[PDB]
Amino acid sequence: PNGVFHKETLDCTLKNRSTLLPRLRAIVDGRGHHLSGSTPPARSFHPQVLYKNCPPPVLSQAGYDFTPMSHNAFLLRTNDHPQGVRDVKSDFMKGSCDYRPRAYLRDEVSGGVNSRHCHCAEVYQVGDYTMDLARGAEIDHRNRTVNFEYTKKGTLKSGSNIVGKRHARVPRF
Amino acid sequence: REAICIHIGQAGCQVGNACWELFCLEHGIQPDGAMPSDKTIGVEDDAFNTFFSETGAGKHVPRAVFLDLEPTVVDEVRTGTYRQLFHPEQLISGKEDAANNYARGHYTIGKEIVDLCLDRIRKLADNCTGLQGFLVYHAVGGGTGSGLGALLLERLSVDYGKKSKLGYTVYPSPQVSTAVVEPYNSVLSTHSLLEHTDVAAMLDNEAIYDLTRRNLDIERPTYTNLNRLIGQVVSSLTASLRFDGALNVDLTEFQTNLVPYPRIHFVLTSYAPVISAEKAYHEQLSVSEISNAVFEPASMMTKCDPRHGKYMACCLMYRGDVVPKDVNAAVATIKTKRTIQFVDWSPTGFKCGINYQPPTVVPGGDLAKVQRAVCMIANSTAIAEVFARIDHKFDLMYSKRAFVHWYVGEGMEEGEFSEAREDLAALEKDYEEVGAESADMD
Amino acid sequence: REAICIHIGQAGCQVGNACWELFCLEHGIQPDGAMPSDKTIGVEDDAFNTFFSETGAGKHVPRAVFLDLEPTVVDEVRTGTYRQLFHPEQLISGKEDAANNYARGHYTIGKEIVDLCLDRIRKLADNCTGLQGFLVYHAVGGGTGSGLGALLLERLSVDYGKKSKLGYTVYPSPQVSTAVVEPYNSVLSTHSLLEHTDVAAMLDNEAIYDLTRRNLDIERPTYTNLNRLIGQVVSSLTASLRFDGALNVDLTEFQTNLVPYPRIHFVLTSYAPVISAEKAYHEQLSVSEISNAVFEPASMMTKCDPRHGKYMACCLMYRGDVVPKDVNAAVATIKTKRTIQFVDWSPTGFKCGINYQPPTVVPGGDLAKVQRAVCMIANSTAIAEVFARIDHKFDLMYSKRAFVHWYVGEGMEEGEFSEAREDLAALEKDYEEVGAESADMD
Amino acid sequence: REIVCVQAGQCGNQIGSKFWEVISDEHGVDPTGTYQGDSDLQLERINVYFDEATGGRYVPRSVLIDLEPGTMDSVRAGPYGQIFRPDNFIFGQSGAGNNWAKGHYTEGAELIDSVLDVCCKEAESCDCLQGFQICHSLGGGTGSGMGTLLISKLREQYPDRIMMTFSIIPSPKVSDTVVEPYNTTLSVHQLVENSDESMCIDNEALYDICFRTLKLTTPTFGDLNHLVSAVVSGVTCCLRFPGQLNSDLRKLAVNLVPFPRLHFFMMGFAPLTSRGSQQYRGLSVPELTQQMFDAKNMMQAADPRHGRYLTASALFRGRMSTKEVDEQMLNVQNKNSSYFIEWIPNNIKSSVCDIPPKGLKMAVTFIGNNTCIQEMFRRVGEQFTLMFRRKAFLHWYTGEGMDEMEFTEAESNMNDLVSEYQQYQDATIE
Amino acid sequence: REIVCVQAGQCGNQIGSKFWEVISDEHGVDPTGTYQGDSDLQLERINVYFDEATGGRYVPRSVLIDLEPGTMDSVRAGPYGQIFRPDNFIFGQSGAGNNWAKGHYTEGAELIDSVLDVCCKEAESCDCLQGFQICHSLGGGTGSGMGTLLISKLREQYPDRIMMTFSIIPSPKVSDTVVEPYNTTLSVHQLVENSDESMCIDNEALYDICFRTLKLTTPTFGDLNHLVSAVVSGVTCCLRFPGQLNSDLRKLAVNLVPFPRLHFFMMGFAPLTSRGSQQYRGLSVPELTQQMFDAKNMMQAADPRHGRYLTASALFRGRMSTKEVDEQMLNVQNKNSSYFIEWIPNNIKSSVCDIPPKGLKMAVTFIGNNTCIQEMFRRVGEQFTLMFRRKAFLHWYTGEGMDEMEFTEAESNMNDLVSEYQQYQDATIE
Ligand SMILES: Nc1nc2c(ncn2[C@@H]2O[C@H](COP(=O)(O)OP(=O)(O)OP(=O)(O)O)[C@@H](O)[C@H]2O)c(=O)[nH]1
Ligand SMILES: Nc1nc2c(ncn2[C@@H]2O[C@H](COP(=O)(O)OP(=O)(O)OP(=O)(O)O)[C@@H](O)[C@H]2O)c(=O)[nH]1
Ligand SMILES: Nc1nc2c(ncn2[C@@H]2O[C@H](COP(=O)(O)OP(=O)(O)O)[C@@H](O)[C@H]2O)c(=O)[nH]1
Ligand SMILES: Nc1nc2c(ncn2[C@@H]2O[C@H](COP(=O)(O)OP(=O)(O)O)[C@@H](O)[C@H]2O)c(=O)[nH]1
Ligand SMILES: [Mg+2]
């Protein structure tokens, strides 16, 4: 029963099989450990790796008697939907089309940043580097990601806000 | 539909008491938020929702936070008459004040208190479904209002993004004064406010004192009178969201119509039938009379004379029994006047709004009862004169570094004084350049 | 259907007293072990069976053991209010404590008492027909809790097989402290507990004190308050076995969803409507508000900040009047936030449960009465900071051999310190490597 | 022959509520939706504007769209609001901000798919579909942007039907909005390519009609929206009642438009006269013709004496002789011959319908294609150039994402429309 | 012509309880088992779902299987629970833990012989056996593992009957279980070989049905299971009542499946409408057809606009003419021609049954075979590849004993299925 069916759908099947099967190869040991090849360039809990595309927390003693804890924020994510899914609303949701960041086209329609107050809420010093929330993945007018990048083996690569490296030193005569 | 109010410092909390008194009495919520023992719902309609939310048992609670560094004013709110209306978490109080230092509010103490405020505002914003802006009340002359107001507006601008932020600001009066260090705080505030506010309305107590002496018959006015007038103005501007009308105006329309360039967002405010009970029965109060009234400088709540500048845009809000044909005839007559001038690049200078709900009367109030009122917010180059006088007083004190050691001790670099002064100088040059005729430049 | 509870040491027995007080009041068993007069064979009444068994005379007795080396706390249970509820054999007591020494409990004293405990648990397990797990309460900071808890879990793991072991554990607070030798006992306990437990839930007294000050209005809290909160959380997690609901969750489902790798089994716990009666009347308590509450670190019962790590899995338990569409809408709203981050290898991060029985109210309690509640247990890489902070204190103390002669005298080789410290170093490396993005790993 | 209505924005929803009141009254539909009429002539064409519900009820074929439900909430609370189908109300969660670029590009693309789904559901149900009818203002934000967006999508999906728009345009004396020139220019650029016929009304002309002609002491927006609903319901009268000389929307377009870009028309309704002065003069075809050409009864500020008529159409309602109509149209063309374009031998089309609106013996609606509309476009282009040379408020539109080239294209297209009208005004045979 | 039903796991037992309530209501069977119906037409085909017991009682041809009796004890305690035969409840002593390997290999093989014994006892009692019908979720543990085990055994034992499944599949937006991709992939690999026809449902699609169409303020799982019970009882309605154009499960399969691997279908049910709206629209065949093809009324997340229909079937219940059914199906095929595969001359089969469900004048159930289902499998395969590269949670499955080659085979077979759908979507005559 599957003669003509398999004969007619041959080339696409081999193309997809040649694409997918290299990805299914394991890259991690059974103990949850990376293989000898393709080591990560930096450790995970480093300040620039952990907070590559997310603001670091701020801690303060107000409201606590002992060791303080941070707070959640309302910063939404990019309005991206799976390909070929109906517009689903179980109830009234808060869409991300609104709350579009004010860094969109700031350098073109406006004069850009004109004060040092950007360091209060927009520019962060994470470890040995600098994070800027206005210099991430490009977005369109409706708060949607424009560019998608892949590795050699075809894994989606996340955006980065790290712009520059700061050569800090202690002073001397 | 909904809007969240943020009250900062002493002026902002005291103006908040008058505002919530008016909004409760206008919607009909009792001062304690409860309902009679036999009813199942306290009111028949949802119109309150813009400013109040009801629990499933029907108690009302308001969408506001009160922020202060000294406890006394918030403790007065906690022990006053509206104790049961507010949720206790909304009334936030610190231990000690910012001592008239912008540096103390911004760097040392407001930096510690700001995360609790942001957590409370987030808890309010999560209980909303069509938030369309923040309203902020503060004075830029004091330390905590200036420093924490700027820091909080910066954080709000990063977290909420495009949402509009409209400010009601009490600026230092041109000759009445309360503290010596007012120029430094006002300059540094205006420097932060330029980047992080969409429209800022400026008020001066000297103008409201003049208005209460000439129009009202009060020989010894106090801050409660001024705060009731401010509450009436805010109620007039937000009435377009809450009651039926011919031409509604959403809070996003103000920023689109009034701001031509991103730095030119400081507006003048005036209110027409500010009148006493004895004068009100001697005069008729037609649409054309109050429209003629709003352009006279005796009606303004900011001490500036608009005849020394040019208008860029005007927004006129009419509430009450008014007919559109009379509004059109009045605006055409205003347009005819020779002491009213518009920049030649702004031919369509007006935005109109018409609402059917007349202004409410408050039991202890001093305004008369009237069937109609009009309120105006307008952008004009005359505002450049207020900054020039603040900048001259700053230059006089800064030439000898008269008080800078306090600001440097509380955490600020001396460089910040000079930076702010060149930014305000550039704002002065912007107001000179925008006012240049196109026919003159060919 | 059945579950057996094992209570160890001082914290575990006092929390057991609070838990059984709660389970009695929720099912309705009187303190003298009697069903109320209105219950008969007229209607099907079996929900207690998960926690109680009935004798042929109709008295109820609970499926629990209380283990202690000092007599005082169990003698307080024997002389307290529930004297007639417990079978006297269930209350086992030794003569003298383990004196904050893990070595004394494990080698010298617990080896004498351990065979009685296994015989009692066997006698309980023979009177069951669907045992589906053990719940264990102990503190790892004290000598008998660490040593006898480890020895007993090892023996249970040898005798029984393919059975879940879920631990609720009180860890040493990061700056509040009760004894000097806390790091040594906590390291050696965690070393034994790592191999023989399926999921471990962590609690810290410093966090629950902060929660009782912040949410409730108690100025001077004590352990009975903390124990009532723990009793509420355990009742919420086990409610899914005892009452009707839309989505039930068996104890075996927790281990499958929360543990990605066999060593990564430490989870955070939080509870949403911790609120006082006076605050309860200022607020509605909808599903979305309590769902937003369980994710704030101020709601957690362990002093760790999840913003310093990444979530791998979350399990959300809703009980009470909740509708599935609201649970779906709430979880979808949390997923949108940018300050909440999941590792890229865990796309389907959530497990849901929905039960109809609302939480019960205890006569002298401080929590308000509420129609719905949500409880969360979650796995996150932030836990590496808790081990790192215990390990730094261990390195500081062991660098000078500060107390080793006590441990070597009571029967333990000094080598055990180096083995445990190397195992915790490897656990720290597992938490460092697991959080590494796959795109960087190629 | 079925019409589909679209109501967009505050102005469109408010005019629509009064229009559906007038139409429900003319066909005898109770506000509960039950037919309670008193002649079969009312029932036999009810399908043109109404859909049929099962027992007695009829439901109106209209789609209401707005970005904030406030106006829709006002119309739903009104006395006839219940008749509208609940599924036909489409709304978002944040306003247009009075900005064309937001209404066209950001919230427009978010809502447009649900509006197109409703419009397709309504269109595909008809056995034979006639043109669409759209009401909106050009000076606003969601009205201009989403109305022109939806018009473009419907012209792609239904290119063989008719596209008709009723549009409100800025007065020459007082603005209701500061950024009116940008929104008007971009909307006229979209309409001149996509639309088949567009009618324009000035609010200033309705104010002057109410105060000077009807001498109303306290006019309200209900009166202006009633005048608009009266002319709108008059244009369609020959589609839904018998008559001696039937007419149709396509027949009006074929007789009115000489060249495809010249499709912008002026409107007027004749028997406007105060209740006090009605006793002095009776109703007759000469009286209707005199009021019909009187500029007092025309709904725009521009006056015909500054231009020339290319074509005109008159639709008469009532029982009357054809001789009086023919001789009146000949006498008016011969006596005022300098104001009629000479290379067309007869500029006026007439049509006669038997059933007048209740309470009037006769009525006529007038549609005129006159070159004086060029003065409005010239004024709008001047104000646009004044604002654009100085970048007066441009950062809002550029921040949403628009290229300035869009502004230069729209200005060039409107300038060419003004030039084409001016050239045909002064053309000659030679 | 009688069907035997199998209900497995929590989801299956709960949906089954509502199904047997709906079927008992339509044939007038009291929850005590006594016939209390009001027409002989109900009794003459009662055998299709019920077996006949000796006295005044009827027993339902169903097998209930679960690994822990909690759900079975809840349904047995329910208001209709008594009707079920006590010997038909099969249960173990420990749960599946939502793990496929445990449910398939350890407790599955322990209970499967007793389940097969009950299924054979029920099957060999029938005078003529029609296909089996199975309800289960694919994301769970005992549902997926024991359902697919039993399906494989019944296909070995009854290869000439029909095998039909109703299956719940993971939502694209929120997961109900962390390990859904593994269980779903292994179950789909088993089903595509073993099944003849399979219907898939997303709980998210039912939530959108409840919120948008019925506007329920506080829906419960009883409503979702009622919608599912309505469609399942509707597909078989023509098997058990007279009609003008009879249809059968085998005839549906022959018309719907072009090639044996392409047997995954979407479902919909039309007369869904909110309590406020019913006054606005009378029932008619065009209204049912319009709701039938509206994606708002479809119970899957994939949207038809990204794919093409190979075939579809519509079963109508009610007294109606064949002309409107035939012409509606022709008009929908002609108007949306780009969404129908062009090398098949007619994609829709129709069927008409005289007896509608009580309280509705007319009803239709829709079954659709559309290539847009490939995107759901692609999403599940992507999440599977993300989890497998990192060996996510793999030790549970490997500890039970499965070879990883099973995982690589199931992923490869499902990837070939998505490729095959993509090739036939873009195929051409040439
Ligand atoms: N209109 C009005 N102005 C007020 C009111 N209260 C204070 N002001 C003015 O605002 C300025 C003082 O600012 P404050 O609010 O006292 O400063 P603060 O916020 O308390 O800052 P700290 O002194 O550091 O605590 C002076 O110009 C006062 O005249 C008020 O209730 N109404
Ligand atoms: N939450 C809570 N913590 C407790 C309680 N009792 C003691 N703790 C804490 O647990 C630690 C002390 O452990 P204990 O239980 O006293 O140690 P132990 O099990 O008695 O071990 P020995 O002293 O050798 O008998 C300290 O951190 C206490 O704060 C309690 O009732 N509730
Ligand atoms: N005739 C008439 N004009 C109106 C009405 N409502 C608003 N307008 C006019 O339309 C313009 C405002 O456009 P608007 O409807 O507010 O745009 P929107 O904000 O996108 O809905 C102004 O010129 C108003 O005077 C109305 O009910 N009738
Ligand atoms: N529509 C529907 N879905 C259900 C129902 N019960 C459970 N589910 C879903 O089925 C999945 C859980 O599978 P489950 O039945 O627990 O698997 P099992 O443990 O093997 O029986 C989740 O996606 C639930 O949301 C129900 O009554 N109706
Ligand atoms: Mg103060």
Ligand SMILES: [Mg+2]
């Ligand atoms: Mg002790």
Ligand SMILES: [Zn+2]
């Ligand atoms: Zn700052």
